[PDB]
């Protein structure tokens, strides 16, 4: 397909998850969730070249979780 509407969605879903998963939208290796829903710690010492505290594992997490919603929306549309 390459640009058909499901591709509109998925690139705009996963790439959207880790888009600002870069900064402050979701949990990342560094900053972990609290029970009081703070979203702040970030004291983890994994070594990654990157301007601020964005691990390579944060990539796999956010992308892989991006595809659920990515698929859940694309199938939410297709079935409907």
């Amino acid at each position: 397909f390459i640009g058909s509407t499901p591709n509109l969605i998925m690139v705009a879903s996963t790439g959207l998850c880790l888009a600002a998963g870069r900064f402050g939208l979701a949990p990342t290796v560094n900053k972990f969730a609290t029970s009081g829903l703070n979203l702040v710690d970030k004291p983890l010492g994994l070594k990654t070249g990157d301007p601020a505290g964005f691990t390579a594992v944060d990539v796999l997490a956010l992308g892989s979780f991006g595809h659920m919603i990515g698929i859940g929306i694309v199938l939410g549309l297709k079935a409907t």
Partner: protein, 311 residues
């Protein structure tokens, strides 16, 4: 934090202590004074809290002995497939299942006990089977006797791998306490590794074997004309004839329209009014649907990387 962390050459594998009954608990090592020492031995043999104190000694004994149970279960499964191989009537059952009653065990003639062999079917004499192996083996797409010998051996082979694992993880390389203290790893793995992958793996057996085979049977063919199993996954055009959507390849999976597979992945419910079982198309859609859901649920515990909960 989560590492392997094992010891080495902890105990010594020898018969030294087999000849010294009761060697484990301090009270039994003194030999029988009375006849109770014979009884008090057995009740205290698997109680590992009386043996020792620390969890390193207890857990190793516990973990290394689970291999024992699994090494026994597999000798058991192997035996059940073997008696399906040689001593069962299975082929005759497989062709005319609505009549022939299932049988495996066969009784040696001696002591006038051969009367236990019942006239059953397929020109055969043996004991009835209530276990239900035959009505599994049809649903696994097992036709000839050769698949059964291959499980009997393969089952009896991997059984020998377990006792070595049992030996290897107690005498030779024994984990430490910290290794058994990792629940969140253990729970990520069991839930994703066993149940998550073990459902896919089986959802991949049904799709390429049972679904095709069990269509050719109730269509009225018999095991003589059924293509060998490796014919199915090594021939598309053979497979596509049964279900046309294999001609679509893996694109529909990747092009993200799964309605394409509605032929061999269904949602039906109810019993198939030929075999009586559940429609075997959706059972693949069953495990597949679960497997995807387990692997998800195995990621909620953090291990090294600070993603996921702790307990």
């Amino acid at each position: 934090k989560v590492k392997v962390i094992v010891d080495r050459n902890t105990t010594d594998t020898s018969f030294e202590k087999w000849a010294k009954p009761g060697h484990f608990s301090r009270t039994l090592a003194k030999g029988p004074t009375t006849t109770t020492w014979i009884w008090n031995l057995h009740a205290d043999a698997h109680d590992f809290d009386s043996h020792t104190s620390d969890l390193e000694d207890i857990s190793r004994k516990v973990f290394s002995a689970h291999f024992g149970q699994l090494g026994i279960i597999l000798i058991w499964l192997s035996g059940m497939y073997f008696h399906g191989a040689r001593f069962s009537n299975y082929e005759a059952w497989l062709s005319d299942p609505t009549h022939i009653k299932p049988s495996a065990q066969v009784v040696w003639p001696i002591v006038g006990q051969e009367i236990l062999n019942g006239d059953v079917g397929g020109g055969f004499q043996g004991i009835q089977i209530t276990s239900g192996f035959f009505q599994l083996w049809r649903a696994s797409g097992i036709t000839s006797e050769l698949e059964l010998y291959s499980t009997a051996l393969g089952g009896l082979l991997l059984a020998s791998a377990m006792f070595f694992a049992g030996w290897f993880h107690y005498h030779k390389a024994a984990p430490k306490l910290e290794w058994f203290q990792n629940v969140e790893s253990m729970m990520n793995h069991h839930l994703a590794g066993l149940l998550g992958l073990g459902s896919l793996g089986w959802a991949g057996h049904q799709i390429h074997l049972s679904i095709p085979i069990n269509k050719l049977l109730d269509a009225g063919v018999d095991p003589k004309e059924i293509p060998l199993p490796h014919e199915f996954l090594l021939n598309r055009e053979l497979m596509a004839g049964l279900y046309p959507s294999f001609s679509a390849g893996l694109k529909p999976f990747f092009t993200l329209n799964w309605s394409e597979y509605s032929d061999f992945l269904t949602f039906k419910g109810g019993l198939n009014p030929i075999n009586g079982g559940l429609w075997l198309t959706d059972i693949a859609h069953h495990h597949l649907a679960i497997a995807v859901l387990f692997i998800i649920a195995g990621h909620m515990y953090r291990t090294n990387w600070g993603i996921g909960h702790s307990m």
